[PDB]
Amino acid sequence: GDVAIATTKASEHGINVTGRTAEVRVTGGTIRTSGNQAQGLRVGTENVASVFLQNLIIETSGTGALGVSVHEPQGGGGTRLSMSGTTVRTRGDDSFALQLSGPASATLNDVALETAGQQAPAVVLWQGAQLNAQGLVVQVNGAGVSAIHAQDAGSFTLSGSDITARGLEVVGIYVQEGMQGTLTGTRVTTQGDTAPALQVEDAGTHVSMNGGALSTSGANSPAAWLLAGGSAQFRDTVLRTVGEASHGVDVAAHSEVELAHAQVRADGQGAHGLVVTRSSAMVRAGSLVESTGDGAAALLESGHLTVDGSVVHGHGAAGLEVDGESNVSLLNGARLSSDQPTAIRLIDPRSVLNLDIKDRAQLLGDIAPEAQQPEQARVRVALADGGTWAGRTDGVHTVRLLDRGVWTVTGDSRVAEVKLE
Amino acid sequence: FCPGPVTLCSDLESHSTEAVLGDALVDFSLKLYHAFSAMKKVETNMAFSPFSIASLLTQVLLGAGENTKTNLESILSYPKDFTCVHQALKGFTTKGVTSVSQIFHSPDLAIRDTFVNASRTLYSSSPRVLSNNSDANLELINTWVAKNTNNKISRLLDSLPSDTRLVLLNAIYLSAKWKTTFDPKKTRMEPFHFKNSVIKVPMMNSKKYPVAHFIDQTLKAKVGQLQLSHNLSLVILVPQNLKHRLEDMEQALSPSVFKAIMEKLEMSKFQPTLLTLPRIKVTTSQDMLSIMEKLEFFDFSYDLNLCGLTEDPDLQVSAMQHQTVLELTETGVEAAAASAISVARTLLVFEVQQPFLFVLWDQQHKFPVFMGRVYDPR
């Protein structure tokens, strides 16, 4: 039941609770170890030890050093940690603020932990390692590789926390090897040089965000990157992505993004609001996708893009802009405009674009290759129950229209076929 | 006059040339690739070893006369009096790829002892002599080549001419393996785009395989470099998108372009990556005679002079053959996989889904040992 300060020389293990199956409830004070590979508050053991580190400063500093890093074996449930205040600050080549190994269990309320090392993540969670966190202000720097890094079936839930990574190749929130992350109130930020705000990739991991202004900058840095079967599902987020070569949301092979009612604004040089590659996005009740740059905002390539009750916008260069075998499907008023001619560009003339429009959609733009092409191309179109194209094509193959279908053509257009109904 | 016995140049220039030798090798590899892409069929994956062709042609040169000497010298893009090249070539000989180059001739044909001894000293081999007849001679050719390449090259040469005064021969197969073992299980069927049709092809996958990747705008291509054993690097050039046809990249490839690409690559770093790539297995037999014709060279066809090699007034290559074998799979040099304590966070995802141009490279001497292209990865 420690209550006061505990300094330390350049020697590790300022406070460790390895075994004896007890609780510490350190009330407050300060630990300022500075050894090499020293750790202020290791709690695990070689081979239940609940602690409560109430407000207290752990400003260690040393190569390989790390603040409280309780780790426990797979068996026997786990160990409980609970913090508050505790401005844990580290500065070391690989110093972790919170590394939580097998079956760990922690709950945080006002952590506000900082690091400045070389490849030092703020909180890394290994196997097991369920985490509940509020008011986190973790901010990383240096040439590291990630802020909160969740791995191998970990389960973390952040509320009202903010993550501000810095330094080149730094990821805001990196989840992979299975996860159940849930962010609510988070405002993950970032600095450029290939610094995706949120990277999720297992084909088993799943992130569910809520009103979290994922924001990047600098060189190519996907705001949200879903890889190898990852699964994001947003709720009123703001994926501002002002950065050269950036991407509002990059959904890669086997991945699936359930974006819903969230602004996804990409800005800067060649960058797409949403790049779906051999995956399946679904913008349900969304609110926007902008490009404003060189590239289009809705780049499909073998992807099942499904807008619904949202505006995909070619504000800068182009709208959908498929190049591949897409399966686009607008409905319920998807104002896929481009503030320009040629809403749905497509570089490949024969890109099999099984486009669609249903029940309220408005395609307010043209279709066009990157050149002039009179050949036969693999592009379709459909409309019904209010679907309304409002543009010129010059490049479509079949434009079959169903009941309530309204093409409302505007100018010269060579079309390989039509079917009115 | 015939060229005098070679002088073993001082070790001073033994390494003062390796730069010039590497640049000449790269230029020759580009030229020979263009010739091959000419001769072969359009959508036909091919592989060849500019290293081995260069070595065999250097053998010929050492046995060359004067006019053909100069012609082949220009073809290989060598400086005049590039003597140490011979010894220089020996320095380039790497342990990762096993080569077999040889010269056969009719027992009637006479071979100057000077050339025999010099070649034995440098190239550690001497012109084999054929039997009195030919058919059994072809049998012997095939058997010798097969048993001197660990049986990898089974049936090297078949269409041997009825009359054969002289023959060159060469064949090489890569022996180095992946410096980082690929998982077998990760191999999966995936979509490959040879044309509009999309095929399901096997491909191995690595979660965090250390690649060296970037984009060269001029050629409008993505270049990815992978590591091997024996200090070897597999460079793969893929079109930027699914639209850019590989013919486009091949034609757009120029000496300076390729040199800049390779240098910028070598200065790069091996950032982790989610890597997907199809199992590469390319075999290629081919008659060099057509290629030699299509490189402005003709002495192999007309008015061949090889005093340094023989004395026959009627001199000609009856049939010069080449064979190359490449096979890469999950058989890496070592399972480099790591444990949970890693924070790697794979950065840039790399996957080849269309016919690519691949060069295997030394990076210890900066010359392309192998070169070719893959269209049908099966």
From TrEMBL, chain A:
Domain of life: Bacteria
Ranges in coiled-coil conformation: none
Designated name of the protein: Vag8
Residues of the full protein shown: 54 to 486 of 915
